[PDB]
Coordinates of C-alpha atoms in Angstrom, one line a residue:
Chain Z
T1 CA -11.8 -23.4 18.6
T2 CA -8.9 -25.7 19.7
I3 CA -9.4 -27.9 22.6
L4 CA -7.5 -30.9 23.6
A5 CA -6.6 -33.1 26.4
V6 CA -3.8 -35.3 27.2
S7 CA -3.1 -38.0 29.7
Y8 CA 0.0 -38.0 31.9
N9 CA 0.9 -40.5 34.6
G10 CA -1.8 -39.8 37.2
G11 CA -3.8 -37.2 35.5
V12 CA -4.8 -35.1 32.6
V13 CA -4.2 -31.8 31.0
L14 CA -7.0 -29.9 29.3
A15 CA -6.2 -26.9 27.1
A16 CA -8.0 -24.5 24.9
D17 CA -7.7 -21.3 23.1
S18 CA -10.2 -18.6 24.1
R19 CA -11.8 -17.3 21.1
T20 CA -15.5 -17.4 20.2
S21 CA -16.1 -16.3 16.8
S22 CA -19.3 -15.2 14.9
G23 CA -17.6 -16.2 11.5
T24 CA -14.9 -13.6 11.0
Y25 CA -15.4 -11.4 14.0
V26 CA -14.4 -12.3 17.5
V27 CA -17.3 -11.9 19.9
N28 CA -15.2 -13.1 22.7
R29 CA -11.6 -13.2 23.0
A30 CA -11.6 -14.6 26.4
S31 CA -14.0 -17.5 26.5
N32 CA -13.3 -20.4 29.0
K33 CA -14.0 -23.7 27.1
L34 CA -12.7 -25.7 29.9
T35 CA -16.0 -26.3 31.8
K36 CA -16.0 -27.9 35.2
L37 CA -18.3 -30.9 35.4
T38 CA -17.4 -32.0 39.0
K39 CA -14.3 -31.3 40.9
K40 CA -11.9 -33.3 39.0
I41 CA -13.7 -33.7 35.8
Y42 CA -13.9 -31.2 33.0
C43 CA -15.0 -30.9 29.6
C44 CA -13.6 -28.9 26.7
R45 CA -16.3 -27.5 24.6
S46 CA -16.3 -26.9 20.9
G47 CA -19.1 -26.0 18.5
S48 CA -22.1 -24.1 19.4
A49 CA -21.4 -22.2 22.7
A50 CA -25.1 -22.3 23.4
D51 CA -25.3 -26.0 22.9
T52 CA -22.2 -26.9 24.8
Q53 CA -23.0 -24.8 27.6
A54 CA -26.4 -26.1 27.9
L55 CA -25.1 -29.6 27.9
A56 CA -22.4 -29.0 30.3
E57 CA -24.6 -27.4 32.8
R58 CA -27.1 -30.2 32.4
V59 CA -24.4 -32.8 33.0
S60 CA -22.7 -31.1 35.7
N61 CA -26.0 -31.0 37.4
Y62 CA -26.7 -34.5 36.9
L63 CA -23.4 -35.5 38.2
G64 CA -23.7 -33.5 41.3
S65 CA -26.9 -35.0 42.1
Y66 CA -25.4 -38.4 41.5
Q67 CA -22.4 -37.7 43.7
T68 CA -24.5 -36.6 46.6
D69 CA -26.6 -39.7 46.1
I70 CA -24.0 -42.4 45.9
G71 CA -21.9 -40.6 48.6
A72 CA -18.6 -40.9 46.8
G73 CA -16.5 -39.5 43.9
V74 CA -17.6 -39.6 40.3
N75 CA -15.8 -41.7 37.6
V76 CA -14.8 -39.9 34.5
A77 CA -16.4 -42.8 32.6
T78 CA -19.8 -41.8 34.2
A79 CA -19.3 -38.3 33.1
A80 CA -18.3 -39.2 29.6
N81 CA -21.2 -41.7 29.4
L82 CA -23.7 -39.0 30.3
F83 CA -22.4 -36.5 28.0
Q84 CA -22.3 -39.2 25.3
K85 CA -26.0 -40.0 26.0
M86 CA -27.0 -36.4 25.7
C87 CA -24.9 -35.5 22.8
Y88 CA -26.3 -38.7 20.9
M89 CA -30.0 -38.1 21.8
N90 CA -29.6 -34.4 20.5
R91 CA -27.2 -35.2 17.7
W92 CA -29.3 -33.6 15.0
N93 CA -30.1 -30.4 16.8
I94 CA -26.7 -29.5 18.2
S95 CA -23.2 -28.8 17.0
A96 CA -21.0 -30.1 19.8
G97 CA -17.6 -31.5 20.0
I98 CA -16.8 -32.5 23.6
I99 CA -13.9 -33.9 25.4
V100 CA -14.5 -35.2 28.9
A101 CA -11.3 -35.6 30.9
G102 CA -10.5 -35.9 34.4
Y103 CA -9.2 -37.8 37.2
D104 CA -10.9 -40.5 39.3
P105 CA -9.1 -42.6 41.8
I106 CA -10.1 -45.9 40.4
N107 CA -9.0 -45.2 36.9
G108 CA -6.5 -42.4 37.2
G109 CA -6.7 -39.8 34.6
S110 CA -8.9 -40.3 31.6
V111 CA -9.9 -38.6 28.4
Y112 CA -12.9 -39.2 26.2
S113 CA -13.6 -37.7 23.0
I114 CA -17.2 -37.1 22.2
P115 CA -17.3 -35.9 18.6
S116 CA -20.4 -34.5 16.6
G117 CA -22.0 -37.8 15.9
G118 CA -22.0 -38.8 19.8
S119 CA -19.5 -41.5 19.7
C120 CA -17.5 -41.8 22.7
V121 CA -14.1 -42.9 22.5
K122 CA -11.4 -43.3 25.3
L123 CA -8.2 -42.2 24.3
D124 CA -4.7 -41.1 25.5
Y125 CA -5.2 -37.8 24.1
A126 CA -7.9 -36.0 22.3
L127 CA -8.2 -33.1 20.0
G128 CA -11.3 -31.2 18.8
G129 CA -12.3 -27.9 17.4
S130 CA -11.7 -26.4 14.0
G131 CA -8.2 -26.0 15.2
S132 CA -7.6 -29.7 15.7
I133 CA -6.9 -30.5 12.1
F134 CA -3.8 -28.7 12.6
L135 CA -2.5 -30.7 15.5
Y136 CA -2.8 -34.2 14.4
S137 CA 0.4 -34.1 12.5
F138 CA 1.9 -32.1 15.5
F139 CA 1.1 -34.9 17.9
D140 CA 2.1 -37.7 15.4
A141 CA 5.4 -36.1 15.1
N142 CA 6.1 -34.4 18.5
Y143 CA 4.0 -36.1 21.2
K144 CA 5.6 -38.7 23.0
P145 CA 3.5 -40.2 25.7
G146 CA 4.7 -40.7 29.3
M147 CA 5.3 -37.0 29.9
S148 CA 5.4 -35.6 33.4
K149 CA 2.7 -33.2 34.3
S150 CA 4.8 -30.1 33.8
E151 CA 6.1 -31.4 30.4
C152 CA 2.6 -32.1 29.4
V153 CA 1.4 -28.8 30.4
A154 CA 4.0 -27.1 28.3
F155 CA 3.4 -29.4 25.4
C156 CA -0.4 -28.8 25.4
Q157 CA 0.4 -25.1 25.4
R158 CA 2.7 -25.4 22.5
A159 CA 0.0 -27.5 20.7
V160 CA -2.6 -25.0 21.3
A161 CA -0.4 -22.2 20.1
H162 CA 0.4 -24.0 16.9
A163 CA -3.1 -24.6 16.2
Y164 CA -4.2 -21.1 16.9
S165 CA -1.5 -19.6 14.8
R166 CA -3.1 -21.1 11.8
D167 CA -6.7 -21.5 12.7
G168 CA -8.4 -18.2 12.1
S169 CA -11.1 -19.5 14.2
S170 CA -9.1 -20.0 17.3
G171 CA -6.9 -17.6 19.1
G172 CA -6.4 -15.5 22.2
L173 CA -5.3 -17.0 25.5
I174 CA -4.5 -20.6 26.2
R175 CA -6.3 -21.9 29.2
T176 CA -5.1 -25.1 30.7
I177 CA -6.1 -27.3 33.7
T178 CA -4.5 -30.1 35.1
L179 CA -6.6 -32.8 36.9
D180 CA -5.1 -35.5 39.2
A181 CA -4.9 -36.5 42.8
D182 CA -3.8 -33.2 43.8
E183 CA -5.7 -29.8 43.5
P184 CA -6.6 -28.6 40.0
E185 CA -4.2 -26.1 38.7
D186 CA -5.7 -23.8 35.9
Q187 CA -3.3 -21.6 34.0
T188 CA -3.8 -19.0 31.4
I189 CA -1.1 -17.9 29.0
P190 CA -1.9 -14.5 27.4
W191 CA -1.3 -14.2 23.7
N192 CA 1.7 -12.1 24.1
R193 CA 3.5 -14.7 25.8
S194 CA 2.4 -17.7 23.7
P195 CA 5.0 -20.2 23.2
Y196 CA 4.5 -20.1 19.6
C197 CA 3.3 -17.7 16.9
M198 CA 3.9 -17.0 13.3
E199 CA 4.5 -13.3 14.0
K200 CA 7.7 -14.2 15.9
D201 CA 8.9 -17.3 14.2
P202 CA 12.2 -16.3 12.5
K203 CA 11.3 -18.2 9.4
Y204 CA 8.5 -15.9 8.6
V205 CA 10.3 -12.6 9.1
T206 CA 11.4 -12.3 5.6
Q207 CA 8.7 -11.0 3.4
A208 CA 7.7 -13.0 0.4
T209 CA 9.0 -11.2 -2.9
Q210 CA 5.7 -10.2 -4.5
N211 CA 6.2 -6.5 -5.2
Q212 CA 9.4 -6.5 -7.2
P213 CA 10.5 -3.1 -8.6
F214 CA 10.6 -2.7 -12.3
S215 CA 13.9 -3.7 -13.6
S216 CA 16.1 -4.5 -16.6
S217 CA 16.7 -8.0 -15.2
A218 CA 15.0 -11.1 -14.3
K219 CA 17.2 -11.2 -11.1
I220 CA 14.9 -10.8 -8.1
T221 CA 16.1 -8.4 -5.5
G222 CA 13.4 -7.7 -3.0
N223 CA 10.1 -6.0 -2.6
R224 CA 9.9 -2.2 -3.6
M225 CA 9.8 -0.5 -0.2
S226 CA 10.0 3.0 -1.3
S227 CA 9.0 5.2 -4.3
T228 CA 12.4 6.6 -5.0
Chain K
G1 CA 6.7 -4.3 -63.8
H2 CA 9.2 -6.4 -61.7
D3 CA 9.6 -3.6 -59.1
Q4 CA 6.2 -2.4 -58.1
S5 CA 5.4 -4.7 -55.4
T6 CA 7.5 -6.3 -52.6
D7 CA 5.6 -9.6 -53.3
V8 CA 7.7 -10.1 -56.4
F9 CA 11.2 -11.4 -57.2
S10 CA 13.1 -9.9 -60.0
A11 CA 14.8 -12.4 -62.4
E12 CA 18.0 -12.2 -60.1
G13 CA 16.0 -13.1 -56.9
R14 CA 16.2 -9.5 -55.7
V15 CA 13.3 -7.7 -54.2
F16 CA 13.3 -4.2 -55.6
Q17 CA 10.7 -2.6 -53.4
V18 CA 12.9 -3.6 -50.6
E19 CA 16.1 -2.2 -52.2
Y20 CA 14.1 1.0 -52.8
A21 CA 12.9 1.2 -49.3
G22 CA 16.5 0.8 -48.4
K23 CA 17.4 3.9 -50.3
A24 CA 15.1 5.9 -48.2
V25 CA 17.2 5.0 -45.2
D26 CA 20.4 5.7 -47.0
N27 CA 19.2 9.2 -48.0
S28 CA 18.2 9.8 -44.4
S29 CA 20.1 11.5 -41.4
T30 CA 23.0 9.5 -40.0
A31 CA 23.0 7.4 -36.8
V32 CA 25.7 5.7 -35.0
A33 CA 25.9 3.4 -32.2
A34 CA 28.6 1.7 -30.1
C35 CA 28.2 -1.3 -27.8
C36 CA 30.7 -1.4 -25.1
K37 CA 31.2 -3.5 -22.1
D38 CA 29.3 -1.3 -19.8
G39 CA 26.3 -0.4 -22.2
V40 CA 25.2 0.8 -25.5
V41 CA 25.2 4.3 -26.8
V42 CA 23.4 5.5 -29.7
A43 CA 23.4 8.9 -31.4
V44 CA 21.7 10.4 -34.2
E45 CA 21.8 13.6 -36.3
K46 CA 18.3 15.2 -36.5
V47 CA 18.0 17.4 -39.4
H48 CA 15.4 20.2 -39.0
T49 CA 14.0 22.0 -41.8
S50 CA 12.7 25.0 -39.7
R51 CA 14.6 27.2 -37.2
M52 CA 11.5 27.3 -35.2
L53 CA 11.2 23.6 -33.9
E54 CA 11.1 22.9 -30.3
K55 CA 14.3 21.0 -29.0
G56 CA 12.7 17.6 -28.6
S57 CA 10.9 17.6 -31.9
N58 CA 11.1 14.5 -34.0
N59 CA 13.0 12.4 -31.5
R60 CA 14.4 9.5 -33.4
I61 CA 15.2 7.7 -30.3
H62 CA 12.5 5.8 -28.3
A63 CA 12.5 3.9 -25.4
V64 CA 11.0 0.4 -25.9
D65 CA 11.3 -0.9 -22.5
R66 CA 13.2 -0.1 -19.3
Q67 CA 16.4 -1.6 -20.7
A68 CA 15.9 -1.2 -24.4
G69 CA 15.7 1.5 -26.9
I70 CA 15.2 2.0 -30.6
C71 CA 16.9 4.7 -32.8
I72 CA 15.2 5.0 -36.0
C73 CA 16.9 5.8 -39.1
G74 CA 14.9 6.7 -42.3
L75 CA 11.3 7.6 -42.3
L76 CA 10.5 8.6 -38.9
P77 CA 6.7 7.8 -39.1
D78 CA 7.5 4.2 -40.3
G79 CA 9.9 3.9 -37.4
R80 CA 7.3 4.8 -34.9
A81 CA 5.4 2.0 -36.1
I82 CA 8.3 -0.3 -35.4
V83 CA 8.8 1.2 -32.1
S84 CA 5.1 0.5 -31.4
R85 CA 5.6 -2.9 -32.4
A86 CA 8.8 -3.3 -30.4
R87 CA 7.0 -2.1 -27.3
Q88 CA 4.2 -4.5 -27.7
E89 CA 6.8 -7.3 -27.7
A90 CA 8.5 -5.9 -24.8
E91 CA 5.3 -5.7 -22.8
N92 CA 4.4 -9.2 -24.0
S93 CA 7.6 -10.5 -22.5
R94 CA 6.8 -8.8 -19.3
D95 CA 3.2 -9.6 -19.1
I96 CA 3.4 -13.4 -20.3
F97 CA 7.0 -14.2 -19.4
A98 CA 7.5 -12.1 -16.4
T99 CA 11.0 -11.3 -17.7
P100 CA 12.4 -8.3 -19.7
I101 CA 12.8 -9.2 -23.1
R102 CA 16.4 -10.2 -24.0
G103 CA 17.7 -7.9 -26.7
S104 CA 18.7 -10.6 -29.3
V105 CA 14.9 -11.6 -28.9
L106 CA 13.7 -8.0 -29.3
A107 CA 15.7 -7.5 -32.4
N108 CA 14.5 -10.8 -34.0
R109 CA 10.9 -9.7 -33.2
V110 CA 11.5 -6.3 -34.8
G111 CA 13.1 -8.1 -37.8
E112 CA 10.2 -10.6 -38.2
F113 CA 7.8 -7.6 -38.2
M114 CA 9.7 -5.8 -40.6
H115 CA 10.3 -8.7 -42.9
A116 CA 6.6 -9.5 -42.9
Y117 CA 5.8 -6.4 -44.8
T118 CA 8.3 -7.6 -47.6
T119 CA 6.3 -10.6 -48.6
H120 CA 2.7 -9.5 -49.3
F121 CA 1.4 -7.3 -52.4
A122 CA -0.8 -5.3 -50.0
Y123 CA 1.9 -3.7 -47.9
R124 CA 5.1 -2.0 -48.6
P125 CA 8.4 -2.4 -46.8
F126 CA 9.3 -0.1 -44.0
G127 CA 11.6 2.9 -45.1
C128 CA 13.6 2.8 -41.9
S129 CA 16.3 0.9 -40.1
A130 CA 15.9 0.3 -36.5
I131 CA 18.9 0.4 -34.2
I132 CA 18.0 -1.6 -31.1
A133 CA 20.1 -1.1 -28.0
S134 CA 19.4 -3.3 -25.1
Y135 CA 21.0 -4.2 -21.8
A136 CA 19.0 -7.0 -20.4
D137 CA 20.2 -10.3 -19.2
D138 CA 21.9 -11.0 -22.5
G139 CA 24.2 -8.2 -21.5
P140 CA 24.9 -5.0 -23.8
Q141 CA 23.6 -5.5 -27.3
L142 CA 23.2 -3.5 -30.4
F143 CA 21.3 -4.8 -33.5
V144 CA 20.2 -3.4 -36.5
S145 CA 17.1 -4.4 -38.4
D146 CA 17.0 -3.0 -41.9
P147 CA 13.9 -2.7 -44.3
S148 CA 14.3 -6.2 -45.5
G149 CA 14.0 -7.4 -41.9
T150 CA 17.6 -8.6 -41.9
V151 CA 19.0 -8.2 -38.3
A152 CA 22.5 -8.1 -37.2
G153 CA 24.4 -7.5 -34.0
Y154 CA 27.2 -5.0 -34.1
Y155 CA 29.9 -3.5 -31.9
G156 CA 29.5 -0.4 -33.8
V157 CA 27.3 0.7 -36.6
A158 CA 26.5 3.6 -38.7
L159 CA 23.4 4.3 -40.9
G160 CA 22.1 7.0 -43.2
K161 CA 23.8 9.3 -45.6
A162 CA 27.2 9.7 -44.2
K163 CA 27.4 6.0 -43.3
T164 CA 30.3 5.2 -45.3
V165 CA 32.4 8.0 -43.6
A166 CA 31.1 7.4 -40.2
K167 CA 32.1 3.8 -40.4
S168 CA 35.7 4.9 -41.1
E169 CA 35.6 6.9 -37.9
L170 CA 34.0 4.3 -35.9
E171 CA 36.7 1.7 -37.0
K172 CA 39.3 3.9 -35.2
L173 CA 37.6 3.0 -31.9
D174 CA 38.6 0.2 -29.7
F175 CA 35.5 -1.6 -28.8
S176 CA 37.0 -3.9 -26.2
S177 CA 38.2 -0.9 -24.2
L178 CA 35.6 1.8 -24.9
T179 CA 33.2 2.9 -22.1
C180 CA 29.8 4.4 -22.4
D181 CA 31.3 7.8 -21.1
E182 CA 34.0 7.9 -23.8
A183 CA 31.4 6.8 -26.4
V184 CA 29.0 9.6 -26.0
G185 CA 31.8 12.0 -26.8
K186 CA 33.2 9.9 -29.7
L187 CA 29.9 9.0 -31.4
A188 CA 28.6 12.6 -31.0
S189 CA 31.9 14.0 -32.3
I190 CA 31.6 11.6 -35.3
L191 CA 28.2 12.9 -36.3
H192 CA 29.5 16.6 -36.2
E193 CA 32.4 15.5 -38.5
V194 CA 30.3 13.7 -41.1
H195 CA 27.5 16.4 -41.1
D196 CA 27.5 18.3 -44.3
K197 CA 26.8 22.0 -43.4
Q198 CA 25.9 23.8 -46.8
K199 CA 23.1 21.2 -47.3
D200 CA 21.5 20.7 -43.9
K201 CA 22.1 23.9 -42.0
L202 CA 20.0 23.1 -38.9
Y203 CA 20.8 20.1 -36.8
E204 CA 21.1 18.8 -33.3
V205 CA 22.5 15.5 -32.3
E206 CA 20.4 13.4 -30.1
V207 CA 22.0 10.8 -27.9
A208 CA 20.9 8.0 -25.8
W209 CA 22.3 5.2 -23.9
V210 CA 21.5 2.2 -21.8
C211 CA 24.4 1.4 -19.4
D212 CA 25.5 0.5 -16.0
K213 CA 25.6 4.3 -15.0
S214 CA 22.0 4.7 -16.2
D215 CA 21.0 1.7 -13.9
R216 CA 20.6 -0.1 -17.1
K217 CA 17.7 2.1 -18.1
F218 CA 17.5 3.5 -21.7
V219 CA 17.6 7.3 -21.6
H220 CA 18.6 10.3 -23.5
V221 CA 21.8 11.3 -22.3
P222 CA 22.0 14.8 -20.3
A223 CA 22.8 17.5 -22.7
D224 CA 26.1 18.3 -20.6
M225 CA 28.0 15.5 -22.2
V226 CA 27.7 16.6 -25.8

């Protein structure tokens, strides 16, 4: 799993790969890990599909009740707070990295990370999933904040692609959604138009030279490609 | 009693059992070899005792690695022992050091091994000189290790019974200019001149090379060039 969210001026992007794996087999290659909580507030789920689907459904339910009751929009902080509560109450029995991100008019776009222990941290961007370990340096090196919506979408797609090109546990599509004052725009990049992969990076086209032919010299030539 | 074991010096600091093994090599069939700029050619006169051998019998020329070979002169069985040791060294170089054994190294190893059997009362010296022909990263190389274990590099070399004549004929060649193609002709020709016919009535001449044309692989030369 690779999930992330990034703020831009006036909203957020969420992004995720689509793969759900039972270890080394892919049970679902088109999962949707961007889960709607309210109209403009989403979570990205990582960890146990079961656990995260159960919490998201629970929180989305509570939040719809709450919106009907106060007769007004919900804040992202409220959604994060609830998520945090539930994640923390059940911290021993669930595996669950969440990101809660969305747009509310009081605070603009926000991002909260709620990692396994049930901390809740408000950030500019957040990463989660097994694939996130691959993006920390990518962000450190290549993410400048203050990006436009469209730049930010493309950057999150790149970021996911980089992650899932190295994490065996992430893969498939890249789903994104933006969340701001306007209508949510979901997008889905199929793998074969991924903005990065190792199988198409020109610096990984030359094969490692492992299967040298038997020679009278130490000079390395190439792999032996044919018997003759 | 000065001459019964190789573990013993004579009063002049000779080791007779080595000189004696030496004589085994000199009473043997003749070999020659030439180290050109494009490779090494080694040829050797096989003397049969029977008219009924298979062609191929008692090869005196053995590959030791892709790029190296040993032509034995003297007791063939003793040589196959050296050839086995050379092959173990070549394998070691590839297995441990992931490189083909350089020829100077191979010949040194061969020499060390032969010399070892001149030091200890329990073994005798080998009755064979090995000619080593390599063409590894050190270039074309031709060494000879004699029964004492003394090793020397040569441009051209002759061993066995006609060695003194064959050397006179090898001196007429121009080693700076000579090519492996020409040498197969010359070296074989030489072994036909110095062969004595009324003694050793049955003989073929086995030739092998390692050169740029053979893709620096050590091989018998096709029997069209002879």
